Amino acid sequence: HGEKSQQAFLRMRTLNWYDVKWSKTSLNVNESMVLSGKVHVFSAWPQAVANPKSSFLNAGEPGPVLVRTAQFIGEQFAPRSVSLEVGKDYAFSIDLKARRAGRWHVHAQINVEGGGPIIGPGQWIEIKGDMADFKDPVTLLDGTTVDLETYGIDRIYAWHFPWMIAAAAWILYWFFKKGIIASYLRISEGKDEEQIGDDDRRVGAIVLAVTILATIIGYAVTNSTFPRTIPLQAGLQKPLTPIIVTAELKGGVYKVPGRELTIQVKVGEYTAAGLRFLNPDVFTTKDYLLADRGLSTDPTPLAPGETKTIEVKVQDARWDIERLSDLAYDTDSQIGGLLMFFSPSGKRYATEIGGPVIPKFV
Amino acid sequence: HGEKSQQAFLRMRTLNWYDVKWSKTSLNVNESMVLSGKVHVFSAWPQAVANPKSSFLNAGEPGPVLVRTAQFIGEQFAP
Amino acid sequence: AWHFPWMIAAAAWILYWFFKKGIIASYLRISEGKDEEQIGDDDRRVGAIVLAVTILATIIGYAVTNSTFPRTIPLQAGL
Amino acid sequence: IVDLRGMWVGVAGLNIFYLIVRIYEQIYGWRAGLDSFAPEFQTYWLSILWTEIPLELVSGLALAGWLWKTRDRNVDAVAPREELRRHVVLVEWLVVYAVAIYWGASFFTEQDGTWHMTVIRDTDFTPSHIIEFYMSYPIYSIMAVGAFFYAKTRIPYFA
Amino acid sequence: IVDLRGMWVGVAGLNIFYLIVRIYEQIYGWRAGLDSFAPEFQTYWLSILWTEIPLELVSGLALAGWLWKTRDRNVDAVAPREELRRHVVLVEWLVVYAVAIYWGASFFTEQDGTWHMTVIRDTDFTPSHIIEFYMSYPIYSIMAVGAFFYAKTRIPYFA
Amino acid sequence: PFHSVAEAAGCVKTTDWMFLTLLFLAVLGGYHIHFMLTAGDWDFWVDWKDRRMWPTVVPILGVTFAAAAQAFFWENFKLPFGATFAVSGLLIGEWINRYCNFWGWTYFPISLVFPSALVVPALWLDIIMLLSGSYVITAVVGSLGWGLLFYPNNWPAIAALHQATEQHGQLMSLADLVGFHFVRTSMPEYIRMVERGTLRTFGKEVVPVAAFFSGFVSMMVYFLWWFVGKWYSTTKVI
Amino acid sequence: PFHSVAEAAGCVKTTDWMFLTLLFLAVLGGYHIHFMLTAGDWDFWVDWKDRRMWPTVVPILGVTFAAAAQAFFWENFKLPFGATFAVSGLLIGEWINRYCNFWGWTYFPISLVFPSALVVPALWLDIIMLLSGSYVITAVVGSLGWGLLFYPNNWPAIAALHQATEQHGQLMSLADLVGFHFVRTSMPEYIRMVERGTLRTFGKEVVPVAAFFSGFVSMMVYFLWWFVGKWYSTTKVI
Ligand SMILES: [Cu+2]
Ligand SMILES: [Cu+2]
Ligand SMILES: [Cu+2]
Ligand SMILES: [Cu+2]
Ligand SMILES: [Cu+2]
C-alpha cells in the first residue's frame, strides 16, 4: 500500500512515527475508528525534501473504504495543511468511518506537499457488510439533514447531462445539410452555402437564443437551490501546538545485505522507519512493521544523574524485508530515528539520532 | 481612500492597529504633523499573504499634499 | 585506457569513410541522379556490423567495469 | 463488390478484448496487483506485461509484413472502381483506429488519474499505469502503422 | 597553376603564434598577472590588451581594404579555369578560419573554465578571460571577414 | 466508378456516416488526453472547483481543440457542427471515464468528481460562427462569451454543492467537506512524453506521406489566443 | 576547367581532403563552445558526475549538433560519417583543453576533470542512420538508445572512481573525496553573449550573401526534440 519503494535514507529522516494504534479493527458499514499516532519531525531535515512547513496527515485508504469525520494533528483538526516544526513533536489521530466492504491495511500518513508523501505505520481494518448501505451524513447550518455519499449526484445528471442532450441537437440535426462527402464535393464545387445560406443560419441563431435563454434559467433557479452559499475554504493556520537522554551516534556500521546495524550512542527501544526495535531486555510486545526481539543492548542500566559511552546493536528481520538495507543507493548514507528510553519504573525520556552510518557487504 | 474593498478576512489578520493618533489636524502650508501608531503583527499570518518579512509604513496621502520629513517604525526611521 | 579507445574507433569511421569517396567525389556523386554509390548494401551491412561489434564490445565494459568493484555507491551530498 | 464491415473482426475483436481487460483489472490488480513486492502481483497481474510488449512488436511488424507484400505492387494503374473501394476499406481502419484511440486517450489515459488518487504509487508498473504507458498506446499504435501502411500500398495517391 | 599551400603563412603563422601565447600566459599571468592591482600585471600581462584590440581593428579593416581593391573588378566574366582555382584558395581560408576557430572555441573558450576554478575572479580581465572575450574571437573574427570578403570579390557567384 | 445510383448513393451515405465517427471517437481522444494535462483537474475534484484559479484555466485550455475542431469541420464542410463537435467528446469522454473508473474502481462519489459543463459555450461559439462565418469575428466575439458563460453555465451542477456546515468550530462548503471525506493522494510522477512525441506521432503523423494537404489548418491556435475574455471571464469573482 | 586528369583528380582528392578539415576543426568549435554552456559541466567534475541530474543533461544537449552535423553530412553525401563526426570533435576538443589547461595550468587531476564518453552512442546513431536512411526512423530509434547507452557507456571511466572510504565518521566516494581534495571556486560571472550574436555571427553568418542555399538544414533541431528516451535514459537510476 506504498512504502518499501521509498529509499530508506529519507523515509528515515523526514518523520519519526511512535505511539501508533487503531481504535477498532473490525468496524462495520458505519462504525467509526481512529488512527492513533504521535510523530516527531527530525531535527536534521533532508535538504532534499522541502521544509515540512506545510503538509497533511491522512488515510492510506486504498480507495476510500472509510471516510473522514475529522482529524487531529498538532493542536487542531485541519482541512488544509498545517505546519510541522523542525524538531518539535505533534500528536494526532484521525476519525474515519467504514463505508466500503473489504479488509485492507490502512496507513496513517502526513503527506508533505513540500515535495513528499511520508507514510507512517498502518493497520488492516476488517470492515464488514455491504457498501450498498453506508451513509455519511451531516447538516448545513440551515439544519437540512443531508447524506453526503449520495447528495446532489441527482442534481448533476439532471443538468450536467441535458446538454450532452442538446448535443445530438447539432450532431444529427446537421446530417440533414448532408453529412461529409455530400458536403465535401458539396464544397469545392464552386461556392457552397448549400450548407449555410439562410434558414440553416437563422436556425442556429434560434438555438443560440434558445440555449442562452434556457441558461439564464439555471443561473436563476440554481441561484435559488440556495440563496446564500460560500466559496471554498482553504489555506493555512500558522498555529499548531506541540506535545509536552541525549544521543550522538559517534560511530556506526551496518549490513549489506544482512539485517543488522550497530551504533555508538553515548548518553529502552528504537524507532525510525516507523519501525519498532523494542529493548526485549524489558519487553512483552502489544505487526510486520514492528520488531519484537528488537534492539540488542549491553544490559548495563543507565539511571538518573549518570552517563555512558553506550553501544547499541539493531538487529531483526524487518530491517531488510521492509527495505532499509537500501542505504546502498540513497545519496546521503546517514540514518535517523528515535530512542525510546524508559524510567526504572517506566517513564520514557526520549532522544533522537541521525548519523552517517557505514556499510560492509557480503 | 482605500479599504472596504479589501475582503475583511485578511485585512483582519495581517496587521492589528491600536494607539493611532495625529499630531495636528490643521497644519498649514508648511507645518509638520505626525501620524501616531503602534501596531501588532498577527500570530497566525494568512498564508495567502507573503511573510511581512519586508514591508513599509506610509502616507495614505491621496496625492502628496504633505511630505516626508522622516519616519518611525520598529526602532528606526527607514527609507 | 577506455575514455580514449573510441577516439580510436573514431578514425574507424573517419578514414574508413573516405573510401566511399570523400567530399566532391561524393557531392556530384550525389546531385547526379540517385546516389547510393555511397550507400547501397555492403556499406550498410558494414556499419550494421560495426554497430553490433561496438555494442557487443560495450556490454563488456559494463560487465568487466561492473567488476572493477562489485559494490560501489552514488555520490554523497546535501546538507 | 464495394465491401461491408471488414470492421467485424475490428470493433468486435476489440471492444470485447479491451472491455474484458477492464474486468480482469477489476480483480487481480485490485486484490493482488495492489503491491509490486507482493507475488500475487508478478503472476496474476504483472503477467500482462511481458505478455503485451512481445505482441506489440510482432504485431507492429505484423502489419508491416503482411500489409506490405500484399500490396497491388503494380498499383497506381488500377481499377477506377477499386480505388473508391480500397478506401471504403482504408476509411474503415481509421474508424477502428478511431475507437482504438479512445481507449488509449479517454480510458486508460484518465483511468490512471483515479489510480494516482488511490495508492501512494508503487512503481510506474501499477495497473492503469501498465495498461496505458505500456498497453493502450502501443496497443493500437499498430492500428495506425497499418491504416496508412495499408493505404500507401493498396491505394494510388499515397506514393 | 592551381595553387599549393597559401596556407603556409596561415596554419604556420598561427599555430606558433597562438601556441606561444599559451607559453607566455604560463609565466606572467601565472606569476604576475595573478592580480589586477599588482603592477606586474599591467606591464607584463595586461600589456597584451591595448596590444590586441589595436591590431584587431586595423586587421579587421586590413583585409577590408587589401582584399577589396584587389578584386577582379571586371569579375563575373572570368577564366573558367580560374574560378575552380580561386576556390582552391577560398576553400583554403575557411580551412585556416577553421583551426582559427578551434582556439576561440575549444581553447581559450574552455581554458577560461579552468581559470574560473582557480582565482576568486579579479576582473573580466584575467588571463584566459583576456585571450578569449578579447583575443581569440576577435583574433580570427578577421579571418572570416576575409574568407568571404575575398570570396565575394575574386569569385562569381558571391555577388 | 460507383455502380447503380443505389450503392453509388449507398456506399456513400454509409461510408459518410461510418466516417463521421472515425473523426469524433478519435479526435476526442487526442483532445481529452490533452485537456487533462492542461486543465490540471480543476475538472476533477469539486474541491478544486473554485472561482478565480479554476474558471480561468479550463476556459482557455478548453479550446485549442474546440477551436481548430471548428475551423476544421466548418471549413471544408461549412458545417457549423464543430465547436460543439469537440466538447461532447470531452464530456462523453470524461463523463464515461468518470463513472466506471473513479466510481466502479476505488468508488468515488459521482459528487467529488465530475467534469465541468461546456456544451453551452460550444454553442454560443459554433453559432456566432454559423452566422457570420469569418475568423476574427468568430474569435473576438464567441471566444469572449465562451468564457464568461463558463461559470454561470456550471452554476447548476456547482451552486448547490457549496452550502456550508460547521465542522468543529470551523467553516467549510458541502463541497470542501466532500473533499475531506473519501480520501486519495498526490500527483504523483512524470516522464509522460516519450509515448507522445514518439510513434503515436511520426508513425501516425506522417500523413502527409511526403506531400502537404493537412489538418495543420489548426492555425486556430490563434482562435485560442484571442481568449482574453476568458481572463476576463475571471473577474466574475467579486 | 581542370587540366590533365592528373591534377583534375589531383586538385580534388587534395582540396577534398584539405576540405574535410575545414568542416571538422571548425564545426567542432562552434559545437564545444556550446556543449559547454549547455552541459553545465556535468562533463567537467567527477563530483558532478552523478546519476539523475547528469545523464539527463549531456544526453539531450549533446545532440543539436551531433544531430544536424549528421543530417548535414549524410544528406549531401549519403556519408553516414556524421553523428560521430561531431562527437570526436567535442572529445578531442575537450580532452585536449582538459590536459594542458586544467592539468598544465593550475594542475588538476586528470581524474577530477575529464569529459564523458560519447563515441559509442554516436555510432548506434550514425548507424541506425546508415541502414534505414530516413529521418523519423533515425530519430525515434537512435535518439532513444543514444541516451540509454550514455551512462552504461561511461561505466568504465566512471564505475571504479565510485568505491568508498570513511572520512571522519562519514561516507564519500573516491569520486566525492577527489572533489574534496584539490580545490577551486564558483561559476562566476556572465554577459557572455555580445561576442556571440555579434560579428562572430553576421560577419561570418552572412553566407548567404543575399541568396539562400544553406546549413539552416539544421532542421535537425527536431532530431533533438525526439530525445524523450534520454529523459528515459534517466530512469536507469533505480
Ligand atoms: Cu502497506
Ligand atoms: Cu497500508
Ligand atoms: Cu478612507
Ligand atoms: Cu500514472
Ligand atoms: Cu570567464
Domain with residue C13: its CATH number is 1.10.287.710
Q: How far apart are CA C56 and CA C64, in angstroms?
A: 13
Q: Tell me whether the omega of the peptide bond preceding residue F188 falls within 30 degrees of 0, making it cis.
A: yes
> Does A47 sit within 8 Å of C74, measured CB to CB?
no
CB count within 10 Å of CB E67 equals: 19
Q: How far apart are CA G105 and CA G107, in angstroms?
A: 5
Give A317's DSSP letter.
S
Give the domain range for residue G99.
1-238
Which chain E positions have a beta carbon within 8 Å of G101's beta carbon? 107, 110-111, 114
Q: How far is the CA of B4 from the centre of ligand 3 (A)?
A: 9
Helix (H) or strand (E) holding G90: helix G83-97
CB count within 10 Å of CB E75 equals: 16
Task: Please report, for the domain that includes residue E157, its CATH number.
Answer: 1.20.1050.50
Question: Could you say which of F191, F198, F206 has the minimum Cβ distance to residue G226?
Answer: F198
Q: How far apart are CA D45 and CA D122, in angstroms?
A: 14
> Does C77 sit within 8 Å of A333, measured CB to CB?
no
Which chain A positions have a beta carbon within 8 Å of C76's beta carbon? 331-333
Contact D127, D116 (CB under 8 A): no
Contact E93, E6 (CB under 8 A): no
Q: CB-based contact (8 Å) between G171 and chain A?
A: yes
Query: Which class for A339: exposed (0-12), middle (13-18), buried (19 or more C-beta within 10 A)?
Result: buried
Those residues with Cβ within 8 angstroms of residue G190's Cβ, 6 or more apart along the chain or in another chain: none
Compute CA distances F37 → C5, D113, D125, F67, whole Å: 46, 10, 20, 18
Q: What is the dihedral of CA D14, D17, D23, D25, to 10 degrees?
A: -100
Given resolution (angstroms) = 3.9
Provide φ and ψ at B33, rounded to 5°. -135, 165
Q: Are A251 and A181 within one domain?
A: no
Provide φ and ψ at A126, rounded to 5°. -75, 90
Q: Report the residue count for chain A.
A: 362
Query: Which class for F27: exposed (0-12), middle (13-18), buried (19 or more C-beta within 10 A)?
Result: buried
Ranges of H-type helices in chain D: 7, 13-24, 52-69, 80-106, 112-116, 127-130, 137-146, 149-152
User: What nine digits make up the cell of F134?
Assistant: 469569418
> Does F191 sit within 8 Å of G232, measured CB to CB?
yes
Contact D131, D108 (CB under 8 A): yes
Q: CB-based contact (8 Å) between D123 and chain A?
A: yes
Compute CA distances A114 → A80, B42, F99, whole Å: 13, 24, 32
Place of cell 578569449: E132
Q: Could you tell me if residue G174 is left (phi over 0), alpha (psi between -120 and 50 degrees) or otherwise beta?
A: alpha
Contact F28, D102 (CB under 8 A): yes
Alpha-carbon E140 to chain mean position:
2
User: What nine digits make up the cell of E4?
Assistant: 599549393
Cα angle for residues G139, G143, G146 (degrees, 5° grid): 155
> Does D118 sit within 8 Å of A1, measured CB to CB?
no
Contact F153, F125 (CB under 8 A): no
Q: Are A89 and A198 within one domain?
A: no
Closest-lying ligand to the alpha carbon of A122?
A: 2
CB count within 10 Å of CB G2 equals: 15
User: What nine digits make up the cell of B12?
Assistant: 483582519
Q: Which residues pair with A82 in a beta bridge?
A: A55
Q: How far apart are CA A170 and CA G79, in angstroms?
A: 57
Helix (H) or strand (E) holding B35: strand B35-40
**In this complex, which chains have at least 3 CB pairs below 8 Å with chain G?**
A, C, E, F
- At F100, the amino acid letter reads C
Q: CB-based contact (8 Å) between D62 and chain F?
A: no
Please check if A311 is assigned to a binding site.
no
Closest-CA distance, C56 to chain G, in angstroms, reads: 11
Q: Report the residue count for chain G.
A: 238
Closest-lying ligand to the alpha carbon of G186?
A: 5
Q: Are A149 and A291 within one domain?
A: no
Q: CB-based contact (8 Å) between A144 and chain F?
A: yes
Give the domain range for residue A164.
136-232
For strands B35-40 and A125-126, give the pairing.
Answer: unpaired
For strands A252-254 and A358-359, give the pairing.
Answer: parallel
Compute CA distances D112 → D115, F90, F137, G142, whole Å: 5, 16, 40, 29
Give G99's DSSP letter.
I
Instruction: List b or e across G8-35, with b for residues whose CB sees 16 or more CB atoms inside 10 angstroms.
Output: eeebbeebbebbbebbbbbbbbbbbbbb
Helix (H, G, I), strand (E, B) or coil at G171: strand
Chains C, A in contact: 3+ Cβ pairs under 8 A? yes
The total of structural domains in chain F comes to 1
CB count within 10 Å of CB B15 equals: 16
Place of cell 556524421: G82
Q: Which of F191, E110, A48 is closest to G115 using CA atoms?
A: E110
Provide φ and ψ at A121, rounded to 5°. -50, 160
What is the helix, strand, coil percentage profile of chain B, to 5?
A: 5, 20, 75
Q: Are A17 and A150 within one domain?
A: no
Q: Determine the residue of chain C that is closest to G17 in CA distance.
A: C22
Q: How far apart are CA A82 and CA A91, in angstroms?
A: 13
Please check if B3 is assigned to a binding site.
yes
Q: State the binding site of D for Cu(2+).
A: 112, 116
Contact B74, B53 (CB under 8 A): no
Q: How far apart are CA F121 and CA F127, in angstroms?
A: 10
- At A227, the amino acid letter reads P
The total of structural domains in chain E comes to 1
Those residues with Cβ within 8 angstroms of residue D5's Cβ, 6 or more apart along the chain or in another chain: D92
> Does G231 sit within 8 Å of F202, measured CB to CB?
no
Q: Which of G113, G24, G65 is closest to G223 using CA atoms?
A: G65
CB count within 10 Å of CB E48 equals: 19
Residues, Cβ < 5 Å to ion ligand 1 = A 1, 105
Show which of residues 4-63 on chain C sit within 8 Å of chain G, judged by CB atoms: 4, 6-7, 9-10, 13-14, 17-18, 20, 22-27, 29-30, 35-36, 38-39, 43-45, 47-48, 50-51, 54-55, 58, 61-62
CA dihedral (E45, E50, E55, E60) positive or negative:
positive
Compute CA distances D41 → A221, D36, D38, D55, D126, whole Å: 51, 6, 6, 21, 9
Q: How far apart are CA A352 and CA A44, in angstroms?
A: 10
Give the domain range for residue D58.
1-159
Q: How many CB pairs under 8 A join F and G?
A: 26
Closest-CA distance, D2 to chain A, in angstroms, reads: 17
Contact A66, F180 (CB under 8 A): no
Detail the DSSP E strand segments found in chain A.
Answer: 16-22, 34-40, 56-59, 70-73, 89-95, 103-104, 107-112, 116-122, 125-126, 137-139, 145-147, 252-254, 260-263, 312-315, 338-341, 349-352, 358-359
Q: Tell me how the structure was determined.
A: X-ray
Instruction: List b or e across G69-87, with b for residues whose CB sees 16 or more CB atoms inside 10 angstroms.
Output: bbbbbbeebbbbbbbbbbb
Those residues with Cβ within 8 angstroms of residue A28's Cβ, 6 or more apart along the chain or in another chain: A98, A127, A128, A129
The angle, 0 to 180 degrees and rounded to 10, between the axes of the packed helices G83-97 and G15-38 is 70
Q: Determine the residue of chain F that is closest to D34 in CA distance.
A: F106
Q: How far apart are CA E116 and CA E110, in angstroms?
A: 10
User: What nine digits make up the cell of D84?
Assistant: 473508391
Q: What is the dihedral of CA A212, A217, A218, A222, to 10 degrees?
A: 160
Task: Please report, for the domain that includes residue A61, its CATH number.
Answer: 2.60.120.570
Q: How far is the CA of F36 from the centre of ligand 4 (A)?
A: 12
The total of structural domains in chain A comes to 3
Task: Please report, for the domain that includes residue G156, its CATH number.
Answer: 1.20.1450.10
Closest-CA distance, D31 to chain A, in angstroms, reads: 10
User: What nine digits make up the cell of G142?
Assistant: 537512435
Closest-lying ligand to the alpha carbon of B60?
A: 3
Residue A214, CB-side half-sphere exposure with 13 Å CA sphere? 15
> Does A238 sit within 8 Å of B45, measured CB to CB?
yes
Compute CA distances A342 → A305, A339, G32, whole Å: 14, 10, 64
Q: Tell me whether the omega of the peptide bond preceding residue A304 falls within 30 degrees of 0, making it cis.
A: no
Q: Which of B79, G79, E42, F108 is closest to C37 using CA atoms?
A: G79
Q: How far apart are CA A329 and CA F68, in angstroms?
A: 49
Compute CA distances F120 → A93, A166, A250, whole Å: 45, 9, 69
Which chain A positions have a beta carbon within 8 Å of C71's beta carbon? 256, 328, 361
Which chain G positions have a beta carbon within 8 Å of A7's beta carbon? 238
Compute CA distances E140 → A178, E134, E145, G198, G199, whole Å: 69, 11, 9, 14, 11
Q: How far apart are CA E8 and CA B38, in angstroms?
A: 84
Q: How far apart are CA A128 and CA G159, in angstroms?
A: 55
Question: Could you say which of G100, G203, G209 has the minimum Cβ distance to residue E144?
Answer: G203
Q: Are A8 and A128 within one domain?
A: yes
Helix (H, G, I), strand (E, B) or coil at B54: coil
Best of A86, A332, A335, A360 to substitute, by most chain C Cβ atoms within 10 angstroms, is A332
Q: Are A105 and A62 within one domain?
A: yes
Q: Are A72 and A182 within one domain?
A: no
Helix (H, G, I), strand (E, B) or coil at E16: helix
User: What nine digits make up the cell of B7?
Assistant: 475582503
Q: What is the dihedral of CA D43, D44, D48, D50, to 10 degrees?
A: 0
Contact G80, G129 (CB under 8 A): yes
Q: Which of A348, A211, A198 is closest to A279 using CA atoms?
A: A348
Q: CB-based contact (8 Å) between F198 and chain A?
A: no
Q: What is the dihedral of CA F217, F218, F223, F227, to 10 degrees?
A: -170
Q: Which of A252, A195, A240 is closest to A56 using CA atoms?
A: A240
CA dihedral (F139, F140, F141, F146) positive or negative:
positive
> Does B45 sit within 8 Å of A235, measured CB to CB?
no
Show which of residues 36-75 on chain F sit within 8 Å of chain A, judged by CB atoms: 47, 49-51
